[PDB]
Structure formats: structure tokens, C-alpha cells
Amino acid sequence: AQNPNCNIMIFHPTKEEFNDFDKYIAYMESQGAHRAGLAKIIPPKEWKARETYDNISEILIATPLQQVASGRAGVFTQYHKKKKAMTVGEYRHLANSKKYQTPPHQNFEDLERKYWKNRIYNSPIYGADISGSLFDENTKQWNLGHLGTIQDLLEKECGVVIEGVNTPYLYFGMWKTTFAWHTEDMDLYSINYLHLGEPKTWYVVPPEHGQRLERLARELFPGSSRGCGAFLRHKVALISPTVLKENGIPFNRITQEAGEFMVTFPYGYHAGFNHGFNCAEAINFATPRWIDYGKMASQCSCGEARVTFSMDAFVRILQPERYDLWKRGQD
Ligand SMILES: O=C(O)CNC(=O)C(=O)O
Ligand SMILES: [Mg+2]
Numbered sequence: 001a002q003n004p005n006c007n008i009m010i011f012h013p014t015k016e017e018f019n020d021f022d023k024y025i026a027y028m029e030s031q032g033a034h035r036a037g038l039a040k041i042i043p044p045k046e047w048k049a050r051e052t053y054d055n056i057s058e059i060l061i062a063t064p065l066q067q068v069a070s071g072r073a074g075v076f077t078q079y080h081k082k083k084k085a086m087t088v089g090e091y092r093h094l095a096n097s098k099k100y101q102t103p104p105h106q107n108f109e110d111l112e113r114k115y116w117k118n119r120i121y122n123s124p125i126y127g128a129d130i131s132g133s134l135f136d137e138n139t140k141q142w143n144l145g146h147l148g149t150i151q152d153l154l155e156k157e158c159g160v161v162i163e164g165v166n167t168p169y170l171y172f173g174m175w176k177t178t179f180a181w182h183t184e185d186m187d188l189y190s191i192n193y194l195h196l197g198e199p200k201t202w203y204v205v206p207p208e209h210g211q212r213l214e215r216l217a218r219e220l221f222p223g224s225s226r227g228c229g230a231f232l233r234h235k236v237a238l239i240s241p242t243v244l245k246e247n248g249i250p251f252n253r254i255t256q257e258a259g260e261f262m263v264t265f266p267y268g269y270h271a272g273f274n275h276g277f278n279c280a281e282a283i284n285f286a287t288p289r290w291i292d293y294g295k296m297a298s299q300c301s302c303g304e305a306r307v308t309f310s311m312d313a314f315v316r317i318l319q320p321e322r323y324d325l326w327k328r329g330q331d
């Protein structure tokens with residue numbers, strides 16, 4: 001068995017190996033990359049996502065989210081308070097202001113210490129989940145707006161044609177902006193490209209151990225657990241590395257820098273934070289190996305998780321027994 005300790009693997013494809021996206025994912029899996037839940041892909045030196053980032057300031061962040069924490073430093077939830085619209089140029093200036101900027105630090109480890117010590121005492125503003133793309137249309141390799149769609153994969157594997165579309169999303173971050181512990185919708189893959197700016201630190205639980213994290217979360221968030229049998233689908237709960245180690249939960253960590261891709265694998269729980277002003281692009285995708293994870297994915301039916309149009313068909317075809325209850329949650 002490849003990668004039996006479930007370590008995060010880092011790949012360096014050549015320009016030739018970067019042509020065929022599906023083939024490279026299957027290669028990484030042949031080496032055991034999925035066992036970690038997360039992999040890093042450093043693009044060939046010849047590749048670029050676009051020519052420059054000099055002209056992005058007029059993108060609108062229609063609903064910036066202020067991430068307000070409750071709890072203790074290592075075990076907290078966050079809620080998202082909606083703020084007034086602002087442009088990417090306005091948001092960058094805010095991120096760089098004395099109130100929001102990255103503090104002085106020695107290295108990524110010192111900054112990670114500072115994040116876990118102090119996150120809860122601040123409410124950073126995240127420009128998350130913005131439909132759109134920063135890949136040039138002429139970038140032919142690993143262009144996250146040109147991937148094979150999940151609807152087409154389901155059709156190819158299972159023969160059923162379904163409605164829905166699959167498009168990328170932009171994330172504009174600042175110091176302390178936070179992504180809570182989650183797996184993807186329908187336990188899909190994700191791919192995330194850090195276009196510019198400061199790094200993003202990731203934490204991940206191997207898929208084979210995901211239920212250990214779920215059991216800890218039910219203990220640590222006991223009211224939320226009684227409210228919903230899949231409350232991590234709400235994407236609000238944070239648990240620090242120190243608390244994970246104290247409770248024996250297997251996990252790994254890695255920092256993504258500008259110009260690098262990360263891939264999350266089906267049922268790989270992940271969480272993390274931004275180091276400073278940055279912009280990432282991410283999209284969900286599927287492969288043949290995903291289908292069985294899709295069939296077994298938990299679902300929120302309490303009403304909180306509320307998701308995209310395209311998840312309807314995935315539930316309806318892969319999980320027909322759950323469909324009626326799940327749809328009641330959506331309506
Ligand atoms: O970058 C973020 O805020 C969150 N991204 C992801 O969870 C992802 O790419 O799967
Ligand atoms: Mg612009």
C-alpha cells in the first residue's frame with residue numbers, strides 16, 4: 001500500500017505531465033497521495049495562470065463576511081456577519097490597515113502560534129465564494145474554469161444525464177481569515193490555486209480517519225451535534241492542532257504559497273487560515289473513484305447547510321432514499 005502513514009505529498013509535474021489533468025490525478029493516487037486527504041502540486045516553471053495581476057482591483061466583493069468567533073482559543077465556532085460591498089482594491093487596503101494586517105513574526109511557525117493564540121479576539125473580513133475566474137482563457141493546462149464537469153463525469157460513469165453546472169469561485173483573504181473543518185459537498189474533490197499574495201496554512205485528516213474527527217466534534221460541540229447529525233456541513237467549527245493532538249486525532253499540516261495548487265480528496269476533512277492579503281480560486285471536481293464516496297456522503301437536512309443548485313441531482317441520483325428529507329432541508 002502506497003503512503004501508508006498518510007503524509008501530505010508534494011508533486012512537481014513537468015510541462016508534459018501537466019497536459020492531461022485527469023491522468024495526473026490518477027498518477028498521484030497511484031502513489032498514495034489521496035491517503036493524506038490533501039496534496040500540493042507545484043506547476044512547471046514554464047507555466048503561468050495569467051500574465052499579470054495588475055488589473056484586478058475593480059472586481060466586486062458584493063457580500064464581504066466578518067468572521068466572528070465564540071468559544072475558547074482552540075475550540076471555537078465562527079459566524080459570518082454580512083458587510084457592505086467593496087471592491088478588491090478597497091478590500092486590499094483594508095487587509096493592509098493597522099487593524100487587520102499581519103503582525104510581525106519570525107517564520108510560518110511563529111505566525112501559526114500567533115493565529116491559534118489570538119484568532120478568537122479578532123473578527124477578520126473574508127471575500128469568499130465569489131463566482132468567477134482569474135485564469136487567462138489562453139492558459140490551457142490546469143485552468144480551473146476549463147475542467148471536465150462533475151455532471152459529465154456522472155454521465156460518463158453511470159449513464160444518467162443531469163441538469164447543473166460546475167464553475168469556479170474566488171476567495172479574497174486577509175490575516176486570520178479562516179476556513180472551518182469540512183469535507184466538500186457530496187465528498188467531492190476540490191482544487192485550489194493561490195493566485196497571489198500571502199500564504200494559506202492547511203490542516204487535514206486522512207479520509208480513512210474522518211469519523212475520528214467527527215466523533216471528537218460531537219464531543220466538543222455537543223449542542224450543535226444534537227441539532228444536526230452532520231453539523232460539520234455547516235462549516236462553522238474550528239479545532240486547533242494542539243486539541244487534535246491531545247485527543248489523538250491523526251492529521252497533517254502544510255502551507256501553500258502563491259503559485260501553488262492544492263488538491264483535496266474525497267472525504268478529506270480540512271481547515272485552515274490565511275496569512276495576509278491573498279486571492280485563491282477553487283472548484284470541485286470528480287473522478288471515477290469519487291462515485292462511491294458520493295453515494296455514502298453524509299448530509300445536513302436541518303436547513304443550515306443550504307447549497308448550490310447542482311447538488312440536487314447528485315443527491316437525487318446517488319442517494320435516492322435520502323432525497324426527500326434532504327430536499328425538505330433545502331426548502
Ligand atoms: O480557501 C478557502 O477559504 C477554503 N478552500 C477550500 O476549502 C478548498 O479549496 O477546498
Ligand atoms: Mg478589475
Ligand code: NI
Nearest residue numbers: 183184190264
Ligand atoms: Ni474545501
Ligand SMILES: [Zn+2]
Nearest residue numbers: 228300302304
Ligand atoms: Zn444541519
